[PDB]
C-alpha cells in the first residue's frame, strides 16, 4: 500500500469531471447503545421518609405521612437492543435498581416509588358514577409507553433519546423545558380504583 | 396540561433515526462551501445518507399467555416483583413488539467533482451528524465511477 | 425458628447455594457472593469502565 | 451541448492576485512545539501559511 | 496573469451537493426555538466559523451566462399514530337514544 | 410515509373459549352475551397503521443563482399546513447545469 | 475430561445468552430467586480460569 500511496491515478484534463459514487455499507448497532444515548436518561425518585424526631401512635399512621426527600438521578442501562417493552422494565428496573438501594435504607415505601414507565389506559375500566374502575382492576391492556409519576418525583430526557422510543415528545423539539414533574401531569391521575368484594359482599 | 407542552407518537425502537454523513475526500473536490481540512471531523462530506438502523415488527403472541401463569401463582422475575400492585405491575406487553434491527444499504449519492490526481491511498470516513466516528459500522465499501463533464 | 433459636431472627440464607442437586459444584469461592465464572457480557456491559 | 462558465464561489475571496503580504513569525504557537526543541531563534522553522487547521 | 493561489481548492465548478439538514447543531439553538420539523431553517454553507445568522447574509454563488437546477432527492421520516385528530381519526358524529318514557 | 402492514391474528379463536369457560369482563365486552353487543369478532388479519421512512427523487428543478447561507424548508400537508408528525426530514439536492443565456 | 479427573463442573467454557446478574439484588450480593433468570439477552461467553 504505503509505495503505491505514492504513485498516482491520473485522471486527466484538458477537461475536468467528476464520478458516480455508488456505496455499500452494514452496520450493528444495538437498539440501546450508549453512545446513541439510549442508555441513559434522569429523573428523580423518593429517598427518605421520616417524621421530626419522635416516632408514634397518633401520627403513628399519620407521622410516617409527614417528611419525604428527593434527588435527582442518571441511571443507565445494559447495552444490547431489546423488544419494545424490554427497554421499558430495564429501566422500569434500574429506576428500582436504585430505590432497592437508598429508598428501604431510609423509610421509603415501594408504595411511594414515584416513577414507573408503562402502557395502559389507566382509566378505560373507568364508570362515570363510581368516578372509578369498576372491575377492581386497571384493565390490563397495553396501549403505548407512558410514564406514571408520583409526587415531587419526574422524568427528564434531555441528555437522552429513550424519549423517541417512549413515542413521547416535546412540542417544540428544541430547546429544554423537557423533564416531566407530577405537577405537569395535570389531571391525568390515576382514578383509583374500586373495591370489588366489599361492593359484592354488602350485595345482599 | 401537556396535550401542548408535547405530543403523542409511536415507538420507535430504533428510537432515532439517525443521519450520517459520508465522507472520503482526498478524491472529490469537496462540495460548495466546505472548505479543505484534514481534521477527521469536518471532512467535507461527499454525500450522506441515513443510517442502516431501521426497525421491523411482529404480533406478540406472548399476549394473554401471562394473563394465566401468574394467575396460576408461580415465581418471579425481577422484572414483576410486584404481582399485585397494579400499579407497580411489569405493564403489559404490547400486541405488536418492535426490533432495532439493521440492514446494509446500497445507496448511490449522484456524481461529483474530483480532483484530477488521486494518491494510491484514498482514505474514506463515515461521520456521524454530530460529525464523528460511528464504530457501530460494520463494513462499508464504495465505488465510484468518474465520469467526464464540461473541458477547459 | 432455626431463627428464634440463635437471638436466644433473620440469618438464614447468607449460604449462597454451593453446589447444584446433582452434586455438580459451583466452584463459588471464597467470600460466596462470585462464583469464578466469568461472563463476557456482565464485564463489559456491568462491570469495568475502561479496563 | 455542454461547454462551460459554470461557476460556483461564494465568499472565501478569490485566492488573490497581485501581491499580499507573507507573514514570517517564528513563535506561533504550534511551530514551537513540533519543530523547535530543535534550536533557538537564530534559525528555527515557520509555517507560513495562517491556516490554523493544519499541524 | 498573477497569480496568488494555494491548496484551499478552486471553489468550483460543475456540480457539487448542497447539503440540506436541519438539526445541525447550531442552526437549532439560533433559529428553532421557532418551530418543529415541518419547516425550520437551515445554514447550507457548512463553514464552521459561521453563525447560522452571518452565514444567512452570505452567498452560495450558482453562476450564469447560463442558469440551471439541480435533482432534489430527500429523505424523511414520521410518526404517525393512527388515530391521531389532526388526521380526524379521532373524531365522528352519530345519534343515539337518550330518553324514554310514555 | 404513512403505510399499513399486516399479521395473522392467532387469538381466533382463543377468546371462544375464555368467555365460554366463565370469567372477568373488559370494558369491551359489557354484553357477553346479547348476541349483537357482543365485542365484535376479532379479524383472522389485524392491520397496523405503521410509518416507515422514505427515501425519495423529486426530479430535477430550476433554481434562483443565488441562495441564502439559510434555506428553509417546509413540508405542507393537502390541506397545506404544517404536520408534526414529522421526524426528521433531510433533504439534499445537487444542483447542475441546463440551458445558457 | 472424563478419561482425566475433569469434572463437568470445571468444563469452563460455555458460550451463551442471558444475563447473569439480573436476578441480583444489592445486600445479599446474590441472586435472590436461586435463579440466573432464564433469559435470553444476547450471545455471552462464560468462562473458568485458564480455559
Ligand atoms: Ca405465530
Not at chain 5, 11 to 27: F, R
Request: charged letters at 25%.
Amino acid at each position: 500500500p504505503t509505495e503505491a500511496s505514492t504513485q498516482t491515478i491520473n485522471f486527466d484534463e484538458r477537461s475536468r469531471w467528476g464520478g458516480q459514487l455508488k456505496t455499500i455499507m452494514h452496520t450493528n448497532m444495538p437498539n440501546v447503545n450508549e453512545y446513541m444515548f439510549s442508555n441513559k436518561f434522569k429523573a428523580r425518585v423518593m429517598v427518605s421518609r421520616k417524621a421530626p424526631e419522635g416516632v408514634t401512635v397518633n401520627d403513628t399512621y399519620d407521622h410516617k405521612e409527614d417528611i419525604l426527600k428527593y434527588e435527582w438521578f442518571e441511571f443507565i442501562l445494559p447495552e444490547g437492543n431489546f423488544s419494545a417493552t424490554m427497554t421499558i422494565d430495564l429501566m422500569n428496573n434500574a429506576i428500582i435498581d436504585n430505590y432497592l438501594e437508598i429508598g428501604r435504607q431510609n423509610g421509603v415505601l415501594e408504595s411511594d416509588i414515584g416513577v414507573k414507565f408503562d402502557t395502559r389506559n389507566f382509566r378505560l375500566g373507568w364508570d362515570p358514577e363510581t368516578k372509578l374502575i369498576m372491575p377492581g382492576v386497571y384493565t390490563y391492556e397495553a396501549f403505548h409507553p407512558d410514564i406514571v409519576l408520583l409526587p415531587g418525583c419526574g422524568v427528564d430526557f434531555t441528555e437522552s433519546r429513550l424519549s423517541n422510543l417512549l413515542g413521547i415528545r416535546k412540542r417544540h423539539p428544541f430547546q429544554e423545558g423537557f423533564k416531566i414533574m407530577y405537577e405537569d401531569l395535570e389531571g391525568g391521575n390515576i382514578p383509583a380504583l374500586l373495591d370489588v368484594t366489599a361492593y359484592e359482599e354488602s350485595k345482599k | 396540561g401537556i396535550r401542548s407542552w408535547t405530543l403523542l407518537t409511536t415507538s420507535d425502537v430504533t428510537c432515532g433515526a439517525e443521519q450520517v454523513y459520508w465522507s472520503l475526500p482526498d478524491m472529490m473536490q469537496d462540495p460548495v462551501t466546505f472548505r479543505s481540512t484534514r481534521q477527521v471531523n469536518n471532512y467535507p462530506v461527499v454525500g450522506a445518507e441515513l443510517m442502516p438502523v431501521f426497525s421491523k415488527s411482529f404480533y406478540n403472541e406472548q399476549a394473554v399467555y401471562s394473563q394465566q401463569l401468574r394467575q396460576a401463582t408461580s415465581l418471579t422475575h425481577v422484572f414483576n416483583r410486584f404481582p399485585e400492585n397494579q400499579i407497580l405491575i411489569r405493564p403489559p406487553a404490547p400486541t405488536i413488539t418492535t426490533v432495532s434491527e439493521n440492514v446494509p444499504a446500497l445507496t448511490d449519492h449522484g456524481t461529483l467533482p474530483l480532483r484530477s490526481s488521486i494518491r494510491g491511498v484514498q482514505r474514506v470516513t463515515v461521520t456521524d451528524a454530530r460529525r464523528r466516528t460511528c464504530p457501530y459500522v460494520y463494513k462499508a465499501l464504495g465505488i465510484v465511477a468518474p465520469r467526464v463533464l464540461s473541458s477547459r | 425458628d432455626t431463627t428464634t433459636e440463635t437471638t436466644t431472627k433473620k440469618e438464614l440464607k447468607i449460604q449462597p447455594l454451593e453446589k447444584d442437586s446433582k452434586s455438580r459444584s459451583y466452584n463459588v469461592l471464597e467470600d460466596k457472593i462470585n462464583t469464578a465464572y466469568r461472563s463476557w457480557y456482565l464485564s463489559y456491559n456491568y462491570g469495568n469502565p475502561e479496563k | 451541448p455542454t461547454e462551460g462558465r459554470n461557476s460556483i464561489r461564494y465568499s472565501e475571496l478569490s485566492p488573490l492576485y497581485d501581491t499580499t503580504k507573507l507573514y514570517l513569525v517564528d513563535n506561533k504557537s504550534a511551530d514551537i512545539a513540533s519543530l523547535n526543541y530543535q534550536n533557538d531563534h537564530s534559525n528555527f522553522l515557520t509555517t507560513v501559511v495562517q491556516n490554523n487547521d493544519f499541524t | 496573469r498573477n497569480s496568488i493561489r494555494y491548496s484551499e481548492l478552486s471553489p468550483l465548478y460543475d456540480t457539487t451537493k448542497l447539503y440540506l439538514v436541519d438539526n445541525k447543531s447550531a442552526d437549532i439553538a439560533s433559529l428553532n426555538y421557532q418551530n418543529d420539523h415541518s419547516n425550520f431553517l437551515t445554514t447550507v454553507v457548512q463553514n464552521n466559523d459561521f453563525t447560522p445568522t452571518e452565514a444567512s447574509t452570505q452567498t452560495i454563488n450558482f453562476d450564469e451566462r447560463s442558469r440551471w437546477g439541480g435533482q432534489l432527492k430527500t429523505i424523511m421520516h414520521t410518526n404517525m399514530p393512527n388515530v391521531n385528530e389532526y388526521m380526524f381519526s379521532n373524531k365522528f358524529k352519530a345519534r343515539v337514544m337518550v330518553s324514554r318514557k310514555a
